[PDB]
Amino acid sequence: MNQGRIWTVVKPTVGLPLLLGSVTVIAILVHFAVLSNTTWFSKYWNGK
Amino acid sequence: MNQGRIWTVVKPTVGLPLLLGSVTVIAILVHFAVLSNTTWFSKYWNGK
Amino acid sequence: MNQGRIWTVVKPTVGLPLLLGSVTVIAILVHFAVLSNTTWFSKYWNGK
Amino acid sequence: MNQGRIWTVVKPTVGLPLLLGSVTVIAILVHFAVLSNTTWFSKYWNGK
Amino acid sequence: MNQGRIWTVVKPTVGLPLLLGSVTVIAILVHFAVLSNTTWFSKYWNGK
Amino acid sequence: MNQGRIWTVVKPTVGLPLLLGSVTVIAILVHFAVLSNTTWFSKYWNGK
Amino acid sequence: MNQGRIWTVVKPTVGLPLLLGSVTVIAILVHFAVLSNTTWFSKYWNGK
Amino acid sequence: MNQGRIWTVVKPTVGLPLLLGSVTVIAILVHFAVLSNTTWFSKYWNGK
Amino acid sequence: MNQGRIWTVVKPTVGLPLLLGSVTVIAILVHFAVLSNTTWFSKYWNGK
Amino acid sequence: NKVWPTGLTIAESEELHKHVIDGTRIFGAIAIVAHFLAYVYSPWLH
Amino acid sequence: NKVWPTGLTIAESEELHKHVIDGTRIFGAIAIVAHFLAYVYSPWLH
Amino acid sequence: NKVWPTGLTIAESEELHKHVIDGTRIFGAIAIVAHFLAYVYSPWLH
Amino acid sequence: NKVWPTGLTIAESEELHKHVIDGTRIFGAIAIVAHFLAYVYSPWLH
Amino acid sequence: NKVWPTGLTIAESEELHKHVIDGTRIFGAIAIVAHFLAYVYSPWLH
Amino acid sequence: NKVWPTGLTIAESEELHKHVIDGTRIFGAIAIVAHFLAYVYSPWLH
Amino acid sequence: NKVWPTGLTIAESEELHKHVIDGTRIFGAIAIVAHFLAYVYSPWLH
Amino acid sequence: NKVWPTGLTIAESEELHKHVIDGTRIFGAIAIVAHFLAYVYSPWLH
Amino acid sequence: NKVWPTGLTIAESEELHKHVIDGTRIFGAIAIVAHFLAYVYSPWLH
Amino acid sequence: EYKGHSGHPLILKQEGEYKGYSGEPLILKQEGEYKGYSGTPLILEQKGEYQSFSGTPLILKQEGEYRGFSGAPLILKQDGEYKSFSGYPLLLNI
Numbered sequence: 027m028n029q030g031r032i033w034t035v036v037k038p039t040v041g042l043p044l045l046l047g048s049v050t051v052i053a054i055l056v057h058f059a060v061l062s063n064t065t066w067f068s069k070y071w072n073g074k
Numbered sequence: 075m076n077q078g079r080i081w082t083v084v085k086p087t088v089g090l091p092l093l094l095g096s097v098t099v100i101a102i103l104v105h106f107a108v109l110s111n112t113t114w115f116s117k118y119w120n121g122k
Numbered sequence: 123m124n125q126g127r128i129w130t131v132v133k134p135t136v137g138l139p140l141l142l143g144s145v146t147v148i149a150i151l152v153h154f155a156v157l158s159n160t161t162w163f164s165k166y167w168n169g170k
Numbered sequence: 171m172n173q174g175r176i177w178t179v180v181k182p183t184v185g186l187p188l189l190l191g192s193v194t195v196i197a198i199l200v201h202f203a204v205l206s207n208t209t210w211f212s213k214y215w216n217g218k
Numbered sequence: 219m220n221q222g223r224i225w226t227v228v229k230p231t232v233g234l235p236l237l238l239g240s241v242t243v244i245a246i247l248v249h250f251a252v253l254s255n256t257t258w259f260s261k262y263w264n265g266k
Numbered sequence: 267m268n269q270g271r272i273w274t275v276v277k278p279t280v281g282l283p284l285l286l287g288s289v290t291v292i293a294i295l296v297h298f299a300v301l302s303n304t305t306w307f308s309k310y311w312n313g314k
Numbered sequence: 315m316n317q318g319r320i321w322t323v324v325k326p327t328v329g330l331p332l333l334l335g336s337v338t339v340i341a342i343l344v345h346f347a348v349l350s351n352t353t354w355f356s357k358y359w360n361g362k
Numbered sequence: 363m364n365q366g367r368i369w370t371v372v373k374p375t376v377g378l379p380l381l382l383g384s385v386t387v388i389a390i391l392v393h394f395a396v397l398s399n400t401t402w403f404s405k406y407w408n409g410k
Numbered sequence: 411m412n413q414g415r416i417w418t419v420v421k422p423t424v425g426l427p428l429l430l431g432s433v434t435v436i437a438i439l440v441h442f443a444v445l446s447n448t449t450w451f452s453k454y455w456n457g458k
Numbered sequence: 459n460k461v462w463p464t465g466l467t468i469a470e471s472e473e474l475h476k477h478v479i480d481g482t483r484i485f486g487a488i489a490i491v492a493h494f495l496a497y498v499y500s501p502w503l504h
Numbered sequence: 505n506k507v508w509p510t511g512l513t514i515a516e517s518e519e520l521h522k523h524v525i526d527g528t529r530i531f532g533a534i535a536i537v538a539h540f541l542a543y544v545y546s547p548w549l550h
Numbered sequence: 551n552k553v554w555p556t557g558l559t560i561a562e563s564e565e566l567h568k569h570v571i572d573g574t575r576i577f578g579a580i581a582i583v584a585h586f587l588a589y590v591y592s593p594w595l596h
Numbered sequence: 597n598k599v600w601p602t603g604l605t606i607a608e609s610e611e612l613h614k615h616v617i618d619g620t621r622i623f624g625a626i627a628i629v630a631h632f633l634a635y636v637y638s639p640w641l642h
Numbered sequence: 643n644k645v646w647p648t649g650l651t652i653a654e655s656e657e658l659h660k661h662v663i664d665g666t667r668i669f670g671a672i673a674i675v676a677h678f679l680a681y682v683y684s685p686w687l688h
Numbered sequence: 689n690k691v692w693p694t695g696l697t698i699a700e701s702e703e704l705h706k707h708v709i710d711g712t713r714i715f716g717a718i719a720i721v722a723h724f725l726a727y728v729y730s731p732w733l734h
Numbered sequence: 735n736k737v738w739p740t741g742l743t744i745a746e747s748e749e750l751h752k753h754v755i756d757g758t759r760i761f762g763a764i765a766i767v768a769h770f771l772a773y774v775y776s777p778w779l780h
Numbered sequence: 781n782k783v784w785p786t787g788l789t790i791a792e793s794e795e796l797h798k799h800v801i802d803g804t805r806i807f808g809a810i811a812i813v814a815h816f817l818a819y820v821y822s823p824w825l826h
Numbered sequence: 827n828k829v830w831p832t833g834l835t836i837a838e839s840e841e842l843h844k845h846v847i848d849g850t851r852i853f854g855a856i857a858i859v860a861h862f863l864a865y866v867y868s869p870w871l872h
Numbered sequence: 873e874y875k876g877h878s879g880h881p882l883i884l885k886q887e888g889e890y891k892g893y894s895g896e897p898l899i900l901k902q903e904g905e906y907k908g909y910s911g912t913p914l915i916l917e918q919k920g921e922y923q924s925f926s927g928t929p930l931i932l933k934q935e936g937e938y939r940g941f942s943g944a945p946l947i948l949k950q951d952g953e954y955k956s957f958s959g960y961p962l963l964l965n966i
């Protein structure tokens with residue numbers, strides 16, 4: 027909340043796509059991590 | 075519905091390909107996830 | 123049929139290769155998925 | 171046959187190497203698929 | 219704290235995205251390392 | 267021998283490296299394929 | 315201490331991020347090596 | 363010894379790095395192949 | 411000691427990073443090779 | 459108004475974003491139907 | 505009208521998009537038949 | 551003030567970063583609700 | 597006629613695409629023969 | 643002073659690096675707390 | 689004749705492609721010998 | 735003196751390398767400590 | 781003679797390729813000895 | 827003499843390459859010692 | 873003109889406009905504002921400063937030297953030469 031000068035030196039053409047991208051990549055990885063290492067999430071999809 | 079100015083600073087030649095692309099890559103990854111980690115989807119293709 | 127202006131802002135030298143390429147890559151991936159996860163498509167090549 | 175204007179908007183310096191290259195890559199992938207998922211292609215090399 | 223001249227010769231357009239990015243990648247890798255090589259972290263998610 | 271004009275629209279600085287390079291990559295992949303899927307080639311190195 | 319002129323011909327915009335980045339990557343690899351190939355480092359995190 | 367005009371159409375700044383690099387990448391791949399598929403080379407390092 | 415002119419046609423901004431980088435990558439690969447394929451180097455870290 | 463570094467004006471960008479949101483709402487509508495079918499014809503919540 | 509940043513007019517873009525849609529409809533038509541063949545000659549729904 | 555090398559003034563940069571923070575606060579709000587749901591319906595903290 | 601953004605006229609593009617289609621038809625014919633040979637010797641349909 | 647090849651003066655570089663160091667020290671502060679919590683709630687040293 | 693977008697004339701392009709054709713023939717001749725030797729010494733067809 | 739192709743003089747490069755060397759000496763010093771800690775607390779040579 | 785698109789003349793290109801030829805001969809000459817040693821000391825043909 | 831396409835004269839290139847030769851010799855001289863230590867303290871030839 | 877080996881024709885070409893094989897229309901015209909399908913509105917028109925959600929404040933101003941949240945100092949100054957932290961010399965010279 028005090029860093030807002032950052033876009034004077036980091037170009038938003040790289041900044042926003044890398045921000046919006048890597049945050050989504052982290053979300054994917056956390057879902058894969060919990061999926062690979064828990065029974066309850068795997069069972070949730072398997073249903074029944 | 076507030077960000078309509080983003081294309082003034084993120085170039086559509088990268089923003090729109092990455093948007094449409096990564097949404098598809100997410101859909102691929104969710105399909106591989108449910109396929110690899112469920113019986114019923116694996117069975118659905120094996121048929122009978 | 124509603125989006126036909128997209129090529130005013132997405133350059134065809136990238137948007138057409140990426141459309142044709144990714145549609146092919148999606149097809150390759152669905153084949154490898156059904157191959158890896160079914161008996162009959164594996165058996166279909168193995169013959170007899 | 172109607173698409174012969176595509177090279178007015180997709181540059182041949184990329185479209186031709188990608189077309190020839192990806193056709194070769196698709197060929198390699200279909201060979202590796204049948205090689206891995208069939209006995210007879212594997213046995214054809216193992217000989218006797 | 220000696221190196222404050224570095225941005226005279228390393229461009230912040232590359233410097234800051236790599237610095238923020240690789241630190242985030244290192245954080246991910248250390249979580250995957252401890253997740254793979256410990257019972258208690260995996261057991262923490264599995265719950266019960 | 268019809269395509270003698272291809273180097274008018276595909277630049278030799280890319281076409282010749284991609285040609286010589288990918289041919290070599292194909293040779294490597296075919297060697298690895300026969301190595302992975304035959305007893306006699308593995309035995310040819312293992313000796314005696 | 316002889317190579318002080320190397321930055322007259324290697325551009326710091328690439329040579330410094332690669333020097334800092336690769337040394338970090340090397341360090342990450344040596345940690346993953348010793349983690350995978352030793353009991354005690356695996357045991358150290360598992361604790362008790 | 364007939365191709366010596368190739369450097370009029372393939373730039374040495376890419377052709378020489380690709381040559382020296384790929385020749386080394388080939389040598390690495392051959393060593394990994396003989397290592398993974400022979401007893402005597404695996405034993406040569408183990409020594410004793 | 412005959413190639414001293416190579417830097418007239420290979421640009422030091424890439425040839426020096428590629429030389430120093432790849433020589434390091436070679437050393438990493440040889441260490442991983444000897445590590446994965448010997449008892450004594452694997453044991454050296456594990457102690458005793 | 460000025461052309462910004464992407465070459466669009468603010469008004470052109472806002473007209474562009476009308477497509478992105480309409481497309482996203484269309485994608486949402488199809489996906490909600492696809493989830494309803496996947497609920498009816500799979501054991502997911504069932 | 506003006507050339508937009510891609511170098512196309514709106515009319516040249518819309519004339520181009522006719523190709524992209526015709527190609528998609530041809531691809532869709534072949535795929536519908538290929539699914540019917542796979543339904544007949546495989547256990548998928550059968 | 552001057553345009554900096556990215557082509558934004560300080561004031562334009564600050565008005566951009568307002569969106570990044572508001573976006574992050576909206577992301578954080580949805581994520582907290584998602585964690586509350588995942589607590590209520592999973593063995594995570596049980 | 598004008599040179600389009602790739603540097604080719606429409607006529608030069610269509611002259612190029614005659615090679616791409618001729619190459620595709622040659623490749624298709626050569627591939628059909630190899631599928632016939634594979635059918636003859638392999639158990640694929642046999 | 644001159645603009646260096648990155649487009650920043652020395653003083654502009656110093657003003658930038660003050661943010662990087664402050665950000666690093668904030669990251670360090672959060673990490674110490676996160677390790678302390680992990681020490682309390684895991685067998686790590688415990 | 690004109691230099692085309694690659695900076696070669698048609699005559700320079702054709703004189704280049706003669707090297708590609710003759711190089712491919714030398715590769716083919718060397719490869720055929722390697723397949724013959726492999727047939728003699730391996731069980732491939734043998 | 736002349737600017738070399740990287741945009742630095744010899745003296746600016748040599749001053750730059752003073753930072754690079756010192757940065758390695760600091761990294762080396764921390765590493766010798768971290769190895770000594772590992773020798774004391776791990777079985778590595780112990 | 782002209783500088784070609786790579787910036788070399790034909791003579792500069794051919795004087796370069798003499799290094800590529802003789803460099804390949806030296807690499808070949810070492811590789812023969814390395815293979816001879818491998819034949820002598822390994823069960824390869826032995 | 828002229829600057830070649832890399833920006834270096836022949837003399838500047840040859841003065842640069844002396845660093846690459848002696849850098850390789852230093853790396854070789856360390857590597858011979860590292861191999862000698864591995865021969866003494868590991869079963870490689872031993 | 874290219875002859876080709878796989879017979880004739882090798883291409884189809886069309887005089888006035890593209891005629892589709894998959895029937896007509898191939899595209900929809902748009903005479904004005906975007907006539908979206910998923911109802912309205914499609915955007916919110918920002919007339920002034922950013923009328924954010926998630927409350928206020930939304931940024932903190934900087935009015936001088938940066939006040940580090942981790943205290944001070946944030947930098948060590950340099951004057952006349954690089955003060956080494958690992959002894960001298962740092963460089964040899966030719």
Ligand code: BCL
Binds near residue numbers: 622626
């Ligand atoms: C010999 C194999 C040659 C070939 C040689 C010829 C010759 C010679 C002629 C054509 C002609 C035609 N070719 Mg051709 N052509 C081949 C590949 C193709 C393929 C493809 C593989 O997809 C297609 C779609 C076409 C398309 C066509 C039509 C435009 C046209 C047929 C009109 C006609 O009189 O019809 C009735 C059809 C016929 C008389 C013959 C049709 C032959 C079919 C198309 C061959 C298919 C390949 C076959 C199964 C495998 C051949 C293997 C090779 C021997 C190695 N060619 C290959 C590369 N083609 C003719 C033309 O221009 O007429 C005005 C013509 O004179």
Ligand code: BCL
Binds near residue numbers: 530533893
């Ligand atoms: C079938 C071979 C061609 C084809 C040839 C034609 C022809 C011929 C016509 C159209 C017509 C129409 N086609 Mg078309 N079209 C194809 C692919 C498509 C696809 C698709 C997803 O595949 C779509 C959505 C469309 C869209 C449409 C509309 C733009 C148009 C008016 C429809 C209507 O309400 O008309 C009224 C009509 C009907 C209720 C029935 C029309 C059925 C059409 C002929 C076939 C549609 C696809 C079919 C159901 C599925 C694939 C079949 C297999 C390929 C065998 N085409 C393929 C590539 N199309 C019509 C038109 O332009 O009218 C002015 C028309 O007569």
Ligand code: BCL
Binds near residue numbers: 486488490491909910
């Ligand atoms: C196929 C149907 C269309 C659709 C057709 C319409 C129509 C028609 C109207 C709106 C209107 C609205 N739409 Mg819409 N809209 C769709 C998708 C969306 C989605 C979404 C995430 O999918 C959202 C958030 C919106 C947003 C909105 C609001 C801006 C607005 C007021 C809603 C309301 O409660 O109206 C009152 C309630 C209704 C009109 C009932 C239906 C509203 C809900 C939101 C639609 C849900 C669709 C469902 C998820 C998918 C069904 C798909 C099947 C193929 C049929 N649309 C899909 C793509 N939308 C309205 C408007 O402009 O008001 C001023 C309006 O008249």
Ligand code: BCL
Binds near residue numbers: 576580
């Ligand atoms: C409705 C959910 C909205 C929201 C709506 C509001 C509203 C409404 C107000 C603020 C206000 C504030 N918001 Mg907000 N805000 C949200 C998310 C955040 C997050 C975050 C990480 O998620 C942060 C750091 C902030 C930051 C802040 C401060 C700038 C300010 C005073 C906080 C305080 O002490 O309130 C103390 C508590 C109150 C004033 C009452 C409760 C207000 C709401 C619930 C925010 C409390 C903060 C808390 C972390 C939110 C968690 C929400 C749950 C995920 C549902 N908002 C989400 C997106 N925000 C206030 C403001 O600007 O006043 C002038 C205010 O009144």
Ligand code: BCL
Binds near residue numbers: 667670
């Ligand atoms: C509240 C936590 C804040 C913080 C708030 C402050 C405050 C407040 C002050 C400093 C001051 C200092 N800080 Mg600070 N600082 C933090 C993080 C750091 C870290 C780090 C790796 O995390 C470092 C290396 C520094 C560095 C420094 C020095 C430059 C300076 C003198 C320290 C000293 O001996 O004070 C001796 C002591 C004092 C004057 C009073 C007590 C201050 C204590 C010692 C601060 C310890 C922070 C500790 C190392 C890291 C955080 C622990 C976690 C919060 C659990 N800060 C975080 C972000 N910092 C001080 C300063 O400017 O001195 C002139 C000062 O007053």
Ligand code: BCL
Binds near residue numbers: 760957961
């Ligand atoms: C924590 C200590 C500091 C440090 C503080 C100093 C100080 C203080 C001095 C030097 C000086 C020297 N330093 Mg220093 N230096 C460090 C790290 C290094 C490393 C390294 C790989 O880590 C190297 C190779 C050097 C190199 C050198 C030489 C150029 C020079 C002594 C030459 C000599 O023999 O003079 C003859 C011998 C002497 C004058 C006295 C003995 C000096 C000894 C040899 C310094 C040994 C440092 C030791 C290996 C670091 C331990 C790190 C960990 C704390 C374990 N420094 C670390 C970061 N350095 C000296 C100088 O500038 O001289 C003009 C000096 O007095």
Ligand SMILES: CC(C)=CCC/C(C)=C/C=C/C(C)=C/C=C/C(C)=C/C=C/C=C(C)/C=C/C=C(C)/C=C/C=C(\C)CCCC(C)(C)O
Binds near residue numbers: 053054
């Ligand atoms: C891994 C596991 C187990 C689980 C993973 C779990 C997980 C993380 C899931 C995450 C899911 C996420 C995040 C989903 C996100 C989905 C989103 C964001 C969808 C967006 C869709 C966007 C569309 C459809 C855009 C269409 C644009 C269009 C049509 C644009 C048209 C533009 C034009 C015509 C130019 C006009 C020019 C002129 C104005 C001049 O006319």
Ligand SMILES: CC(C)=CCC/C(C)=C/C=C/C(C)=C/C=C/C(C)=C/C=C/C=C(C)/C=C/C=C(C)/C=C/C=C(\C)CCCC(C)(C)O
Binds near residue numbers: 152
């Ligand atoms: C992995 C698992 C288990 C599961 C995965 C499941 C999963 C996710 C599946 C997803 C599937 C998806 C998304 C499928 C999407 C398919 C689509 C979109 C197909 C599109 C086809 C488009 C075509 C054919 C375009 C041809 C364009 C053409 C020919 C253009 C020609 C242009 C010209 C001539 C230029 C004119 C210039 C001028 C003269 C006008 O100026």
Ligand SMILES: CC(C)=CCC/C(C)=C/C=C/C(C)=C/C=C/C(C)=C/C=C/C=C(C)/C=C/C=C(C)/C=C/C=C(\C)CCCC(C)(C)O
Binds near residue numbers: 049082574
């Ligand atoms: C692996 C395991 C087991 C575990 C992994 C554990 C692990 C490490 C987890 C790490 C997690 C981390 C780090 C999470 C970080 C999350 C963050 C940072 C989220 C950020 C969200 C940002 C957003 C939503 C930004 C929206 C921007 C927006 C909307 C911007 C709009 C801009 C505009 C309109 C331009 C205006 C132009 C003009 C001013 C001219 O008008």
Ligand SMILES: CC(C)=CCC/C(C)=C/C=C/C(C)=C/C=C/C(C)=C/C=C/C=C(C)/C=C/C=C(C)/C=C/C=C(\C)CCCC(C)(C)O
Binds near residue numbers: 438757758761
């Ligand atoms: C995996 C297995 C089993 C085995 C693998 C084993 C294996 C191979 C290990 C290999 C290990 C290796 C090789 C390690 C090498 C480590 C090295 C070399 C470390 C170097 C550190 C360098 C640093 C810290 C540099 C900082 C520079 C800095 C901060 C520069 C600052 C510059 C400024 C301020 C600009 C000034 C501007 C103006 C001049 C105008 O004042």
Ligand SMILES: CC(C)=CCC/C(C)=C/C=C/C(C)=C/C=C/C(C)=C/C=C/C=C(C)/C=C/C=C(C)/C=C/C=C(\C)CCCC(C)(C)O
Binds near residue numbers: 426439846849850
């Ligand atoms: C996988 C298995 C089992 C097995 C794999 C087996 C296998 C294949 C192994 C292969 C190994 C190979 C090939 C090893 C090769 C090693 C080599 C070649 C090492 C070379 C080192 C070079 C160095 C250190 C250069 C330093 C340059 C320097 C410092 C340059 C300084 C320049 C300056 C100062 C600029 C001056 C500008 C001015 C002022 C003059 O204008």
